[PDB]
Amino acid sequence: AKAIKRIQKIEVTEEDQRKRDLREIEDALIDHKEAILETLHMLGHMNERGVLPLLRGLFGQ
Amino acid sequence: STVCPCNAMMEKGMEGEAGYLTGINNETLRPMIEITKGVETGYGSILAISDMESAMRDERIKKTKTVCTYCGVGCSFDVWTKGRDILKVEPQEEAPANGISTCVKGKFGWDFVNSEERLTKPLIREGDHFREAEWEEALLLIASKFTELKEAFGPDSLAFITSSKCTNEESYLMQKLARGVIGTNNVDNCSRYCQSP
Numbered sequence A: 001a002k003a004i005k006r007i008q009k010i011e012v013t014e015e016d017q018r019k020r021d022l023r024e025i026e027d028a029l030i031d032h033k034e035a036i037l038e039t040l041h042m043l044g045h046m047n048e049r050g051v052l053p054l055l056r057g058l059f060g061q
Numbered sequence B: 001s002t003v004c005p006c007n008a009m010m011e012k013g014m015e016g017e018a019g020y021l022t023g024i025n026n027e028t029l030r031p032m033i034e035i036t037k038g039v040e041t042g043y044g045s046i047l048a049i050s051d052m053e054s055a056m057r058d059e060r061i062k063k064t065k066t067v068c069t070y071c072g073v074g075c076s077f078d079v080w081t082k083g084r085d086i087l088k089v090e091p092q093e094e095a096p097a098n099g100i101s102t103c104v105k106g107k108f109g110w111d112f113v114n115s116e117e118r119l120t121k122p123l124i125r126e127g128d129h130f131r132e133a134e135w136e137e138a139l140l141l142i143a144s145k146f147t148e149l150k151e152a153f154g155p156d157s158l159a160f161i162t163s164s165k166c167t168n169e170e171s172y173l174m175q176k177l178a179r180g181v182i183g184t185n186n187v188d189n190c191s192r193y194c195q196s197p
């Protein structure tokens, strides 16, 4: 066909890009699932032990 | 326990609950106290550490003024609560009717508030049992049946009993419901079996 240069780009809406970015963060959590799960267990123990409430009170007051 | 100036006489509710480091089992906490005692440079240094921790307790322990739900002496006092746990009922000298005085019921008889038997959902009778139902259906059924008996049998076919356990405003609203809403004078409280004479 004849020579053309103009390209009409595909519309990536604000909401579409937001989903792509959030999905990228979701995939990173999925990849580091074990590390997150372990962090949550560790965090749960810090709360059971005196640690998290003590820090909440140290900054609270 | 109220008048004791130290922990020598204390409520079991306070034990292991009030402080951040008081939950540590006595097996581990006892050597900690012995270590600290030996290390200690001066009383003012470790008193400052204890004051900072005492200040931090304000995050956890909530102290709220209340009037005893039991008898007519009208004892008022502060309830010390860490979450839903009642640590101690702390009387105050300013309490107009009782001062620092309390009886077993007001000082220690508050377990019922956290009883596993506490009703948390409206119950609508479904034959030989009670059905747990939404607040909307329970209120809608009370409105439908109260209007039904008021239309067919009159406003005087509906009696209303106020509780002397409940507040002045709750007594006022029960009688405003009976007289102003239903249209009957059929209101009363346990004073009928009590000091009406």
Ligand SMILES: CCCCCCCCCCCCCC(=O)O
Pocket (backbone or CB within 6 Å): A022, A023, A025, A026, A029
């Ligand atoms: C110090 C470790 C910090 C870990 C930060 C975790 C961030 C969690 C992001 C959660 C994203 C939710 C995804 C979504 O709402 O679509």
Ligand code: SF4
Pocket (backbone or CB within 6 Å): B005, B006, B007, B008
């Ligand atoms: S706060 Fe200190 S002085 Fe007061 S009862 Fe406890 S250990 Fe004794």
Ligand code: SF4
Pocket (backbone or CB within 6 Å): B068, B069, B070, B071, B072, B073, B074, B075, B098, B101, B102, B103, B104, B105, B106, B107
């Ligand atoms: S503490 Fe005892 S005397 Fe005081 S109001 Fe309550 S039940 Fe009555």
Ligand code: NA
Pocket (backbone or CB within 6 Å): B001, B002, B003, B004, B005, B006, B009
């Ligand atoms: Na005391």
